[PDB]
Structure formats: C-alpha cells, structure tokens
Design a protein around this ligand. Sequence first.
Ligand code: CLR
Ligand code: CLR
Ligand code: CLR
Lengths: 1074, 34
Amino acid sequence: VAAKTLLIENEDGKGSTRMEVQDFMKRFHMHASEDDKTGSPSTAWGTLRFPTKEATAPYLRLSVNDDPEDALLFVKAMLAQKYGETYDRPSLILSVTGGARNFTLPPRLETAIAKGLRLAAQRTNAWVVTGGTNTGVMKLTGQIMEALSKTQSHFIPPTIGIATYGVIIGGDDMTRGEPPKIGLEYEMHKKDPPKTTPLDDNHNLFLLVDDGSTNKFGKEIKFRAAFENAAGQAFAAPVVTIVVQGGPGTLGTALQAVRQGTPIVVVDGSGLAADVLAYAYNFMHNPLTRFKSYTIDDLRQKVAQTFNPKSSQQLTNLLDSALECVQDPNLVVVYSLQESGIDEFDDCILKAIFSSQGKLGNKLKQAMYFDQLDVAKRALSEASKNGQHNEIAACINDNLMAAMMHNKPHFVELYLGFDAKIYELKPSEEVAKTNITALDELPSFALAIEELYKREAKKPHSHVQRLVSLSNTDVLGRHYRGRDLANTRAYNVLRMDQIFARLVSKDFSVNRDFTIYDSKYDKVPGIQFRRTAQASHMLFLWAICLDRFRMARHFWLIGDQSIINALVASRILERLSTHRALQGPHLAEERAKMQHNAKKFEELAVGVLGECHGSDSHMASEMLHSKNDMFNKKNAINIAYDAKSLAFLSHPATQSVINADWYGHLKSVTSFWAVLFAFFFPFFVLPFINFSGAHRLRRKFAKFYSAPYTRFISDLLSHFVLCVVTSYFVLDKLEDTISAIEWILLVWFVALLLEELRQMIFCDGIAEYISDTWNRLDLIMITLFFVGFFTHASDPSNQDSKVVSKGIHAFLVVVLWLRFMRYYALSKNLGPKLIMMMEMMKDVSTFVFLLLIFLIGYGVAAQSLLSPDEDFSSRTFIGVLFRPYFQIYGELFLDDLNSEANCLGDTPFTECSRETVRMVPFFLAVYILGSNVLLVNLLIAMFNDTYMKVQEAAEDLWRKQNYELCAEYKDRPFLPAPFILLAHVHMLFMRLLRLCGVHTQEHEKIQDDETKRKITTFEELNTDKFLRRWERERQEMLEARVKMTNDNVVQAMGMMDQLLEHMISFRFSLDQQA
Amino acid sequence: RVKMTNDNVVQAMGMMDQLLEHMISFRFSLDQQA
Ligand SMILES: CC(C)CCC[C@@H](C)[C@H]1CC[C@H]2[C@@H]3CC=C4C[C@@H](O)CC[C@]4(C)[C@H]3CC[C@]12C
Ligand SMILES: CC(C)CCC[C@@H](C)[C@H]1CC[C@H]2[C@@H]3CC=C4C[C@@H](O)CC[C@]4(C)[C@H]3CC[C@]12C
Ligand SMILES: CC(C)CCC[C@@H](C)[C@H]1CC[C@H]2[C@@H]3CC=C4C[C@@H](O)CC[C@]4(C)[C@H]3CC[C@]12C
C-alpha cells in the first residue's frame, strides 16, 4: 500500500510531524524542458523496484533550484517511514567519487576497499553518496554496499545516488505515473533514445536532479555537494571523500573538496588521477625513499600519460590542480595496499575523520564507532601531552555516556583510566526539578543513569519498557499502582532499585545514601571511594538491566562487596530471564543467552569464595559474617538463601561458616554427646572448656546458651520428655477423676499451642506458617490432644469415654513420635535419607496404585468364591479388605482358609463341599506371584533408579535445610517448651517495653573500620587472583588453543601472501630494472 | 602436541615477519640502488 502520511522533521530538530505525501513533496519541483526556469512541482517520486532485488528503493526527482535541506528532510522522512522515528542517525557521509567510465581494479585493493567501506558502513551507520549510475566507481560502490545489505539485518545503511535526470535511462518511464509509484519496475535493459546511462540497482535511494536538459552529465555535482554539506550540518557528521581512479573532473572535484575543507581519501593502486594525486602526495608530503625519486616533471609525465591533455597549458593547470589538491597534508589521506595494509582502509577513514574539522569529543565518538582503541588512546595521550587536559576532560563526559550507550567496555575502561571520576557523570539534558525531595536529593550521575534508561527504553521491542509497564508501582517505588512524573521521571533510580529489590525477593531491600555526594563531605577520608562504590553499584545494576555482560564485569571488578553483588546479579538475571515481561519472540535470544550469562556470575561468585578458601579460612569466616550496610545489614549467607543459590550454599567454605554459626562460635564442644554432657553438667564443664573472671565466665555461659545447638538440644530434650510422659500417660489407665499428669500435659501442650500461635500470628504470617509440613503436624497434634482431652473431660466417670480418649490419643502418640523424626535433619547421615525418602514416596504411591488393583480384584473374587451362599454385610467387606493384605506381607493364612473352606480331606484342599471352592489356592498363587515377586521388586528397581537419580540433589537440599534449620533455631526462644509460655511472659515484658512503658533500649555491635578495610582489601586481592587464574584457565583450555593457533595460521597465511606479493613486486622491479 | 604446534606456529610467524622485514629492506635497497 502507498503511504499517505509521512513524518517530516521540524526546523527545531526535536520533533517530527505527520503530513501528507503531496503536501510534503510539493516543495520538490521539476523541469520539463531546458527553457523552463521555475518549472512544475514534481510528479515523479516514489518507490522503484530493481530486478533481482527484494526491496524497492525510493526515488525522488528534485529541481536544480530546489534546496538540498528539503531533500535531506525527505530522506529523513523516508528513513522515518522505513525504520520508525527512532532511526539510526549517521556519523559519516562517505562521498564515493571517481571515474564514471569502467575502472578495473586489482582484487586485493578492491577487496580491501570494499571491506573497509562495508566495515565503516556497518560500524558508523554511514550514508553513501555516489553517482548512482551502474558504471565504474558507483557500480563498485554499489557492489561494496550490496554485501552489507544482505549480511546485516534491522536498519540498513542507505546508498543514496545523486544523478542527473537527462542522462538517467527510464526517467520518462518514471515521469509517466501518478505519484507515489508504489513499486514501479525499473527496466535497465530498456532502449531509451536520449538517455543511455542506467541507474545502479544496489543504490538504496535516488536523487534525480532535473534542470530540464537531456544527455548531460555534471549537472548534479553541486546539488550532491550541497546535500552532503546539509547532511554534515544536520547530523553534525564529518564528510569523507573516497577517491578511486577518476578523471580531470574528479581532480577538480577533489580540489573543490580540499577548498571546501572536506578531507579526501585517495586509494593508491587504482590508477589514473588517484595515482597522480597519490604521486603528488608522495612528492609533496612523504619523505620516504621510494617517494624521494618522485619529481614534479615525473608527476607531469604521469599526468600526461594518464589524463593526456590537448595543450601544455592544460597539463600545467592539471599539475597545478594536483599540487593544490595535495597542498594541505591534513585534507589528503593516501591509502595503499603495499604501504598501509589489508585492514587499514577503515583506519584511513578514521585518520581522515581525525584530520577533519576537529572537535575532540566528536573524534572520540568517531573512534568509539570505528572501535580502534589504540588510536583514541594515542590521541588522548597526545592531547594530555599538549597541555589540553581541560578540553579533554570537558569532553570525556559525553564520550563516556556514548560509550555506555553504544556498549564498548574497552572504551569505558579507557575513559575510566584517563583521569575521570565515575561519580562525576552529568546528563546531556537538564532534569526538571520536582516537588518531591527524593528526586531533589538525587545527584547528576543518577540523572545520567536515568538518561541511559530513557535512551535504552526508547528503542523498539525493548524489554525495559515492558518491565516498567508491568511493574505496577509508583515513582517513589511503592507498589500502590503526577502523570508527568510518571512519564518523564519514571526511570528514576530509586524506583528502579525498588523494582530490583522486589525482583530479588519479597523481603529483599537495598539502601542507598546520596549524602556523601555533597561537597561538604569532600574532606572526609574514603568518601570518594564510597562514591565510586555506590556509582559502580548503580551502573552495575543498570548493566544487568541492559544485559551487557562485559560492562557488568567491569563495574563488578571496580566495585566493592563483589560476592554479594554477584549473588544478587545471578539471582535477578536468572529470575528476569524467566519472567512475563520478557515474553515475546523478538526478545527471544536475550531471554536465553543472558540466562547463560546469569550462570556465568554464579560460577564467578563460587570462585571468589574458592579464592577466599584458597587464602584463609578464618578471614573467609570473618568475610561471611560481615553485614553489608547497603543491604539492610544482612550477612551474605542470608543473601544466598534469599537469592536461592544452591551451588553457593553447597560449598564447604559456606558449610564451615554455617557450622561456625552453630555451637555459638565456640571451638571446644562440637560433638553431640559433648554438648549433651555440657548441657547436663553446666558448672563442671564451662569453666573447664576453652574460651571463644566471674563476668567473663558469665559471658561464656551466655555465649553457650545463646547457641542454636543448645536451644536445639533443649527443644529435643523437651520433645523427648514430652513423648516419654505422654507414653506413660497413654499406656497407664486413666482414673475416675482428672489426674495431675493430665494437668501437666494440659500445661505442656498449652505452652506448645501458645508457642505455635506466637510462631503463626506475630512472627511470620499465616500463609508462611501454613506452607510448612511440621507446623501442620504440630497443629494436628494440638487438635488430637484437645479432642482426646475433651473426650476425657466431658465424662470423667464413664469407662467408655476413657476408651474413646485413649483411642483418640493413640493418634497423638503416633503423630508425636513421628514428629520426633523432624529433629534428624541436623545429622549428616540422616537428613539426605529423609530427603531421599520424601523423593521416594512418589514411587511408594505408584506401588500402592499398582497393588490396589490386585488386592481389590483378588479380595472381591476370593471372598465371593469362598462364600457363595451369603448375604452382603459389613463383614464381607472386612473379609475383602483384610486377609489379602496380610497375604502380601507374609502371613498366608491357609489353615484358616482350609477351616473357612470346610474341606475335610487329609490333603489340605480336598474332599470339599463346593467343587469350585478348591480354586482359592490358584488365585492365591497368582496373587502372591503378582504381589511378592512382581510389584515389590519393581519397587526395588524404582528405589535404585530413584536414589541414583536424586542423591546429590538431596544433598544440596540438605545444605539448604541446614542453613534453614540454623536460621530457624537462631531465632528460637532461649527457654525450652514448658518454660516457653513463661518466656512468652518475658515477651509480654517486651510488651511492657513496647507501648505503655516505652522504655525499650536496644543496640547493635559496630565493626572496626580497619577490619572492614582489611576485608575489602582481602576481597579485592582474592577477586584479582581469581580473575587472573580464571583468565589463565580459560586460555589454557583445548578449544581456545586450537582456535588461537587457527587464527595464527590464518594471520601467518596472510603474512605469507603479503610476502609473496612483495617478492613478486621486487622480481617485477628487478625485471624492469634490467 | 597442540601447545608445541602453537609455539611452533608463533615461532614461524616471527620468522615470517623477520623474512618480510628482510624482503622489505632488500626491496628498499633495490629501490635506492636504482
Ligand atoms: C481359561 C479360562 C480363563 C476360561 C474360562 C474357564 C472357566 C469358565 C472354567 C474352566 C474350568 C471350569 C471348572 C471345571 C470343573 C468344575 C467342576 C464342576 O463340578 C463345577 C464347575 C467347575 C469348578 C468349573 C467352573 C468353570 C471353570 C473354571
Ligand atoms: C487363567 C489361566 C492362567 C489358566 C487357567 C487355569 C484354570 C482355568 C484351571 C487351572 C487348574 C484348574 C483346577 C484344577 C482342578 C480342579 C478340581 C476339580 O474337582 C474341580 C475343578 C478344579 C478346581 C480346576 C478349576 C479350573 C482351574 C483353576
Ligand atoms: C512355578 C510356579 C508357577 C508353580 C506352579 C504353581 C501351580 C501350578 C500350582 C500351585 C498351587 C496349586 C494348586 C494347589 C491346590 C489345588 C487344590 C486341588 O483340589 C486342585 C488343584 C489345585 C487348585 C492346585 C493347582 C495347581 C497349583 C495352582
């Protein structure tokens, strides 16, 4: 369909307005003949489709008196219709100029020129301005640019051809249609009488300058020069002229480009006027020994050989134009394959860009697009050596913001190495001040990170705009689900940090202090280091949020608290890969491979812990008990449990930290029986034990009874005394009145119900407490004791109510002794057997679902077959469901079946009354073959395959339950269970500190700054040692060595081909010298 | 074996760079001799 609306850019350059196609293209005019001066408005514009081309290039016929800024606005409106309003702006205008006739090149120089032009068009997104015809230099530029059109997706570089209308074949066919011509076919083989030069088929745009003449060339040179000057004025881009062969008109074009300030790159080895300009640049600028023999008379003889003028004054004017074209050494850049190299054409384009109109930040942006960091490093060292460090440091902010924009982390490390603070970032546009003080306290680097979030969110199919639109949060970061603050400042970094704290966990939170960024704290020691740490953490969280791995590695390496930030990263990238805001096919591989990158951070985090376990176990235990102040004073193993990293929690150094968090961090009593002997005799063991006056022994006893192992063995001893005293209650006979042991059981389970209600209501929440298995077993033993005690206490004198009370309390016996198995998770040899039994219970339920078929079928058939003449009752159903079971487990009741069958023979099934009654054996025979030889041994094979499947996963789940049991018993009350309600009375004393008295005094231990600086230097030394060892291990792999020697063979084969070409040139010079 | 042939490729690339520098010096001496 033809487009009726086009987005034309405004005169301010900050917006685009939709208009009609005829109303925008009425400013483009045309001339029907040479006598017409004002002419008609143009009716020949639209889309022309070439043969063997999938797309139709837009053509526009414009007048010679029309302005080139309207043609550049029409090209920008065509690019806005092609690739949306957020199209790629060009950074280079490559003016391909040279011979309009056919010019055969050597294949090494044409391959190097086409590879440099394709690499500059792929990297810089450059606009190619050529002649547009399919003959010679413009056809070679179209053959260079057609390889970039197929190998690169998304936005393509446009190849604009500016050509005269009267020489273009098919312009009368282009002028014979109602505009816009949507896909009109261009016939290059059509015989046009007055125009014989067809257009190039690989040119992606056409500008046909119409002065009304026919078969005239050179009428569109000044219009293409004004279009290149208008594009360099509009996009703030340098214009570079590529020159290959060429005539005297190309020499006058290069002389007018050198007079206009445009730098020109001449490719030597292309012959003609380009070799004459290369010989003039060799005689005028090059002091080499091959260029020492070049003379003005030899260059005049080469100009008479190539151009061949009719007069000697024209040869003197051509030699003067070749001298004045190569008079400026900055404006002429000579590229040779025998001098520069094969991969030096884009370096010659970058050298012409550095030798162009020189802004320093635009040269660093063009070097960051061209990706030659040694060129920008030598230019920054030359700018620092010339005393221009203030102009370098003024332009390093926008170059560094473009370096995080275009994702070049070696340039990020280059600008970070060139004396620039990472907390000295300022945005490109000014931020409007809101009435909220949280945005008023945000510094300029937070506005720079919010500018990079708004720049990354302006791309189409962006996952961050779908992340914000599915966030349902406020601009302060609260999830309560003003609109100008929700449109302009919606990507503020406090709201992003609250979305990241929600995206790690439900209870995860971060803490950022901007009050060290004031100028009054500049004299504080280490405030600049904490400023670089907070800015590296914010740019680190932005680097995960843009999923760039190497920039996140660089901000992880220059940041502090590396292990905690790597765990938080790996959790938020592994959860953000499997998220509904990243659903969609176009964000497919960024779904996948970033999850791959997420596993990379998990492996990275383990190795820094391994580097800590390479260095010192005691410094690693001092590392992992340190509470980071940016994450609400949480230790790193709680960050691992909230981050759910099972690979980090199964490490033995983390298990050394968790077993140091057991036993009160006391290195004397570590055995179970030694802790039981210390708990049974406290006064006779704890002075005699090793350490961690009377106040020191009281502090040692207070360190002993605040251990989680001591509270765990107190809860185990209280549960053992509970189960033994309820065993002595339920086995002994209940009296006619209420006994004192029933009052002790009532007070004991009343304290257990008060501790269960204190764990349910005031501690965690109802949905967290209902998800636990053992809390539900505790609730059903509370309900079983209260049902049996209400059945006893409804009628204490009835013996039948005592029978109902013991039959209700047998469930309490079975569930209480089964709840004694929940203390076996602290043992090393019992806990994975419990997790393997809980994995194996699905195979148990599969065996029950297999055996119920055989049991119900043989039970109904067997009980119907031994009793033919019997009415149905309950006892027939008990006779179905009873005996078959116990015939699986071994008691094959047989005499009782011979007595039930009423068979009177001396043989055990003979002389029976019913003749069909001696088939109960045969059904019993096939039942015990189906049960005791088929299904139970299928369990055996299912348990062997089940245990050999999930043994290591049961071990890693035991490590997660080990830190979950240590965190559960660290927050346990210090008293055991029948004292615990009295300890809840002490919690009621905390209620006396809460609201009425309000005299609560609490404090926390503050660590030393020297110990935290030693832990941070230990973290930086272990992280640098692990990244050096991991780079050596990545370089020491087999695949990297065979790929490195394959690239070195390919470079040695290129060096051998260059040495063979230099030896062939030396043999040709030795043949021509003779 | 793959580390020994990687070191031998690196030594052969250094010998090819020295042979290319000697051939460029011989071509510069043949240019200056004319
Ligand atoms: C091979 C099977 C699956 C097919 C069906 C066979 C059944 C219907 C047949 C095969 C042999 C038969 C038995 C053979 C002989 C007698 C003795 C007679 O005094 C009473 C019936 C009784 C006890 C038959 C009952 C039915 C019986 C069990
Ligand atoms: C079902 C497949 C596996 C084989 C079928 C075997 C069945 C039909 C056969 C095998 C042995 C047979 C029994 C062998 C002997 C006797 C004793 C006779 O006084 C009555 C029939 C009776 C009780 C038969 C009933 C049918 C019987 C149970
Ligand atoms: C290797 C295994 C399969 C051994 C074979 C077992 C079979 C053939 C045996 C085991 C028990 C046997 C039964 C035992 C008792 C009786 C009752 C009798 O009045 C008729 C035969 C009958 C019903 C037998 C039939 C054959 C029998 C079912």
